[PDB]
């Protein structure tokens, strides 16, 4: 069995700074013929992969110089010089030199940039949804870094447990970015009960948390 | 230029056959590989097989001999994934990837194709608004959005204004409710000032259940 390895899993980068991601293959890529068909592929998220590097060092048509791959044998580097917002993904090696074609397991390069505040909106329900039966409230935290944030619900004061979502975006590809919705889901019986709704974001940008709320009917 | 567009996402039951496209274009079809790669929920890419198209010939990884066949329509220049006696672990993204032979590579992929394999019935989502934070008439920046809620499978599409507006928008991934079904929300942000102007429709289509629906979203 041909394994590929790659290291590391996750790889933090600053902007301007260097990507060095290693793959290894537990046989070698040198082909009885001379060649070495080892490759590479970026996919982004949602998105299907696109061919990078071929054959160890070549870049495909469009990828710029910045990408360069290197290496022998078993052991390959694929370096992306003065890294860049848009260079946000899962890199894969692949080889073709033994039937049948492998990828390795993959390797995220994440952006590392300065911590960055979250503009806070509250959505109370509407009225087509409380219509049918159960009202969703959603708190949006948009654009922060870093990803960790703490999100609390009140409804009249009390702090709520056990019936809120959390959802966060990938790093944006322009600013590299996160954010994140909270959901407070009640039935509408629950929701009708209270009046004020709240929610409190703690987060490494602000000084001291922020909180957005409405009240019922208004 | 060169492109591979695939079929639709699916829904099937355990035990049923699923048969995926890929149409090509922008090339001559017969004269590349054509093969098919898997992406299982958080995993590695899987390289399953190839059909070469001048020939007819298919060649299967060891783990994709048996449920698993390839057929092409040359004159369509479509290919074809077929997978019967369909398990949960079929359930994965399935790409197309053209091979150019010369340095034995996938130079160009298709967009991927969704197949869950479920025993539930599908549902579509209820859309509804979540209305504008500001008014005019104090400025700056306001968020709005559509809240997609209660289906299954996976996957949505959500756009706004039939695609023209793009540029701040953050369609969130989804989450499961313990209901078992998914929920999600897209969100925009827009000049403030802009609301009394501009109208905001964003349209959501979850295939498999054939539900389309656009919801005007104002204060």
């Known amino acids: 069995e041909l394994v590929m390895t790659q290291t590391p899993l996750s790889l933090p980068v600053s902007l301007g700074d260097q990507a060095s991601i290693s793959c290894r293959s537990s046989?070698?890529?040198?082909?009885?013929?001379?060649?070495?068909?080892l490759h590479w592929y970026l996919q982004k998220p949602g998105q299907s992969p696109k061919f990078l590097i071929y054959?160890?060092?070549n870049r495909f048509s469009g990828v710029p110089d910045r990408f360069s791959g290197s290496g022998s044998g078993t052991d390959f580097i694929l370096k992306i010089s003065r890294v860049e917002a848009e260079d946000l993904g899962v890199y894969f090696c692949?080889?073709?030199?033994?039937?049948?074609?492998?990828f390795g397991g993959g390797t995220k390069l994440e952006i590392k940039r300065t911590v960055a505040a979250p503009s806070v909106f509250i959505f109370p329900p509407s009225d087509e949804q409380l219509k049918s039966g159960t009202a969703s409230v959603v708190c949006l935290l948009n654009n922060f870094y870093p990803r960790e944030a703490k999100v609390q619900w009140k409804v009249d004061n009390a702090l709520q447990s056990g019936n809120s979502q959390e959802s966060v975006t990938e790093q944006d590809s322009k600013d590299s970015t996160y954010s994140l919705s909270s959901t407070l889901t009640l039935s509408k019986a629950d929701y009708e009960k209270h009046k004020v709704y709240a929610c409190e974001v703690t987060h490494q940008g602000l000084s001291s948390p922020v909180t957005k709320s409405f009240n019922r009917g208004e | 230029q060169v492109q591979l567009v695939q079929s639709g996402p699916e829904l099937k039951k355990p035990g049923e056959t699923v048969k995926i496209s890929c149409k090509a274009s922008?090339?001559?079809?017969?004269?590349?590989?054509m093969n098919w790669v898997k992406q299982a929920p958080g995993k590695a890419l899987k390289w399953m097989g190839w059909?070469?198209?001048?020939?007819?010939?298919?060649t299967f990884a060891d783990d994709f001999k048996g449920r698993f066949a390839f057929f092409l329509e040359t004159s369509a220049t479509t290919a074809y994934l077929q997978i019967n006696n369909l398990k949960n672990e079929d359930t994965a993204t399935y790409f197309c990837?053209?091979?150019?032979?010369?340095?034995?590579?996938?130079?160009?992929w298709g967009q991927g194709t969704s197949v869950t394999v479920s025993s539930a019935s599908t549902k579509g989502p209820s859309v509804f608004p979540l209305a504008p934070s500001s008014k005019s008439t104090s400025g700056g920046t306001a968020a709005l959005g559509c809240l997609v809620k209660d289906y299954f499978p996976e996957p949505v599409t959500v756009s706004w204004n039939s695609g023209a507006l793009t540029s701040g928008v953050h369609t969130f991934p989804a989450v499961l409710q313990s209901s078992g079904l998914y929920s999600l929300s897209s969100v925009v942000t827009v000049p403030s000032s802009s609301l009394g102007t501009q109208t905001y429709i964003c349209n959501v289509n979850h295939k498999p259940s054939n539900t389309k629906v656009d919801k005007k979203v104002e204060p």
């Open positions: 692949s080889q073709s030199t033994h039937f049948f074609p492998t």
């Open positions: 046989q070698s890529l040198v082909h009885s013929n001379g060649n070495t068909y």
């Open positions: 922008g090339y001559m079809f017969t004269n590349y590989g």
């Open positions: 059909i070469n198209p001048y020939t007819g010939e298919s």
């Open positions: 990837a053209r091979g150019t032979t010369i340095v034995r590579a996938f130079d160009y």
């Open positions: 054959k160890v060092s």
